Amino acid sequence: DVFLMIRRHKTTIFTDAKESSTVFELKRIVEGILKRPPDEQRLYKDDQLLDDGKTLGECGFTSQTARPQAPATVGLAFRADDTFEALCIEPFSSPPELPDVMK
Amino acid sequence: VNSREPSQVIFCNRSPRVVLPVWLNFDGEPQPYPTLPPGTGRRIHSYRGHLWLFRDAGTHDGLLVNQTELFVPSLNVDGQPIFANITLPVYTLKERCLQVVRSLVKPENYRRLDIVRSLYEDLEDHPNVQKDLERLTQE
Amino acid sequence: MYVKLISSDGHEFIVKREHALTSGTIKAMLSGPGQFAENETNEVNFREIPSHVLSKVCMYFTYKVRYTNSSTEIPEFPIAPEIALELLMAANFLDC
Amino acid sequence: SLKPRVVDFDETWNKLLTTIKAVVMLEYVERATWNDRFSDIYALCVAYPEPLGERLYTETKIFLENHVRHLHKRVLESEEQVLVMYHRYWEEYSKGADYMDCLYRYLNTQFIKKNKLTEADLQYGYGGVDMNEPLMEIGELALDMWRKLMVEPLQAILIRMLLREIKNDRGGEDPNQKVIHGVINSFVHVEQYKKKFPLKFYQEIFESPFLTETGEYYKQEASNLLQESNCSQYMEKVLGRLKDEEIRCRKYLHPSSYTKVIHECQQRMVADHLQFLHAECHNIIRQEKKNDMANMYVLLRAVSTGLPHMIQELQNHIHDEGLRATSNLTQENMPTLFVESVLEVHGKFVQLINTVLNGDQHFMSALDKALTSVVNYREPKSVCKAPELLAKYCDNLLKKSAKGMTENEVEDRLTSFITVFKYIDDKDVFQKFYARMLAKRLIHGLSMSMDSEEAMINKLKQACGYEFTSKLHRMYTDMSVSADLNNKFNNFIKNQDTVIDLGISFQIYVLQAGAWPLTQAPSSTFAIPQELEKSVQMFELFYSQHFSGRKLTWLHYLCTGVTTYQMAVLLAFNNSETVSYKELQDSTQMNEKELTKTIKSLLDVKMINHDSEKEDIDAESSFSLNMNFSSKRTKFKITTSMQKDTPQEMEQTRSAVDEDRKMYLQAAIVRIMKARKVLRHNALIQEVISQSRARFNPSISMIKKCIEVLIDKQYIERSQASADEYSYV
């Protein structure tokens, strides 16, 4: 029951999946939310894309690393206009300096 | 009350934090007991039909056993001791976050924090055993 | 089925309706005026909720939904000290 | 950054007031603006210089004050349309208040904390009752303010309009249900405070005027029905109004008032004209119109005091009907028709209690407590009726009855016989009367089957119990067991050490002497021919040692093989001209002084002068030829007779019942004083009834005779007189 996080530019998705699930099933589940055909869309592990044949177990993740407290982040890119675009993670805002509590 | 004790219970804790149990006698005054190290278990006896309360040793937080607040021993069945497992309750963010603030903030330095006025009273409201058992008398 | 949350910066978060329904403020916002559901119950905008704190709240919602009434062990929820005050303020505002 | 800020409160409230007014009365509001107003309320409650929760609450309270009065003027201005106008505004306000509570969710939490601190200080100081304690939620405050509109003189108008409009049951105007239900439900919907009674307002403002008005209306309606409708058609009118009342109250009234309105309806048309209904109570029961009797029961079920009246009337009809059939059957000398009459009355009336009375075990009690008196009549002094007739009924279905044969039907008829057996009270009389009659059957072996009567003891196994059937179980076992001893000697007679036939053709039915009711040894007698008893004496000595504890006493009461007290022929002659007592001679040692007339009369049918035969002479006999019948031949010389005749003899058996009844009178007390050492005058009475009502009837008339016996057999003086003195020690 690994919990993932799909982030594109500013959009963030909170979903859950099983290790027996596949990248094709993940694409199917994000299709119903993003209203985009799943053939073009592709996923990333911040280093290389994930093939459809490979299942969720063999690409890493696992329950120990992927927990509800600290879910893993999975990139996503669109492949519509015949040209790939660089992964724009766009990280969240930096937290402010900590108050007097630093001791 | 005074009754025979043909029963024994096992105190096994699953929570990461240290557990300090307090047991209610016939008088009703819970007393401190040696702390249970995390991820351990001890074989112990008990009065039949007497409440047990499990609390944190350090900051006195709430702990749940058998998905219940109170623990009542029962008569032994076919030579099998009864097992009690302690789990961390599902704290709310307001309650969970105050625990982080309370540990970090010196108890005489609340007023220097720049937060809302209402949260000052809640932050100063340290958990207390007499308060805890007051909300269990009803029903 | 899926609600939409928007932070002050502009980040967009999509979580399950049941996951987001554990907060009284969000429940009241969703169950307010007359409902048509064609373009309603979505894009819930929070004007003073930063992106990191909103993400932490979403992680709460997922953890609480998953770990409710569970007989297994309950690991503690980790809270960063630098985000503690803002997260506490957001929890107080949202009535978690 | 949710840190406290500075707010002028003179601009956010003005913007918020427009949104709040749109939320009320269900006006369109932008979805984006709805979410934005949540932050404005939060900002006001955390203002940096000082919290503005008090200012926000007071301003919101003022707005609801003016809005309610604005709607109040419009409703009061319009006349004849108050109900329709009130319903339209109430629905908009009811939904608007709920939405405002969600918007003011944050402010509600602050009120709860503030209220709890002051709620703990009310005992020490009221402070004007906590300065008119703020409502826990803003939505609850809105309902309170709408209540003041109800408190306004609109309450008098709304009640008057509602009562008049609901009073259209006379006609068929059919007022709209939605307006009625919405207005009535508003009385209870406004009150949702659980500290007080939620229905307290509704009962005081609407239930009390409605109940009084409903009762008065049906008081006039009940009177008008009597002047035209007869008692028979009055019931049909009652059923229709009661059925329509439930439908009418279902649509318009709150569920909590369903039973109360029906109870008031029943107490007016019924239990106020109960004298009129009771007048026809006797007529309908005597008549066969079962359809109208159903309407009697339905109305009278609700009223508690009405049922006892019809208990007695039904009992009287059963009592009179049973006596007429039983009394007309007298002098018919037929016992099998008595059981048929009782079962027919029970069979016909048990259907009536079911199909047109719907159970009512209380009414079923009337059948049981009335039919029991029919069985024991006792008024005519003839054949004692109930004890003897029941006893003389089972034998006809269990004896030979060659002419009357109904195979596979006696089992059914005997099972149906139990419907009258438990209604009798003199069960002791029946028990011993049946025992003596039963014992006469197996001895002569005229029962039609050996397994047929097995059902009888089984039928009495549970009705009478083991204590009653402890003796009766011994009748069956002996006859079955006696089939084992006779052939045991047959095997033993073939295994004699001396190997001598002895010329024995013998059979024995061993009795019990503890349960067999036949009398034994009325006199000495014990006269037995010598040439026959010698073989029988060998039987006695060679059988006793087999058990080694029993010495059977030989009797000749029911000897056969009937050939009772055989003359042994001899070779002497006498004279017999007329009557009897012709100087009887050569009489051996029998004790037959008073038994001459009973025994000598056996042969007068066959032989008189004792001068015939005596032709052939031989050492033993000639046996030349047989020709006509021989051996048992005619057999028609029996003198045991049927029913034993002798109208004096069975009187001792009934006296023996009284003697046995007297045994229990001084013996049932043993258990009474064994547990209750200290006795009270009322305690002894009915104590025997509580334990022996089924066995016999412990009437107080004969109880006075029992206590006389208790006076004797005691020597401890009874000093006190507070209770009964018949207790020993």
């Binding site: - | - | - | 002497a513 026959l532 009461y557 048992k632």
Partner: protein
């Protein structure tokens, strides 16, 4: 002979007989019932033995007596319930 024969023949003879224990023990003292039947007295001493034969056995006085009816006698009284006492 008008209607008859020499006769003088012997046929089978059957009848009924009554058996007894031959020792009445004068109906004991208080039970005054048949010795075969269960005695009322056996509800107090509670000596469960020979349920078939409640009273017919050897007595305490080395003589034919009730098994338990006379057992209570030693506890309370001294007279002999067998001789010179009838009815009462």
């Amino acid at each position: 002979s008008g209607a008859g024969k020499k006769r003088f023949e012997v046929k089978k003879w059957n009848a009924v007989a009554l058996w007894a224990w031959d020792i009445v023990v004068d109906n004991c003292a208080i039970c005054r019932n048949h010795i075969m039947d269960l005695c009322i007295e056996c509800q107090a001493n509670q000596a469960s033995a020979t349920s078939e034969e409640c009273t017919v056995a050897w007595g305490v006085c080395n003589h034919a007596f009730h098994f338990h009816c006379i057992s209570r006698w030693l506890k309370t009284r001294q007279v002999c319930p067998l001789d010179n006492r009838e009815w009462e």
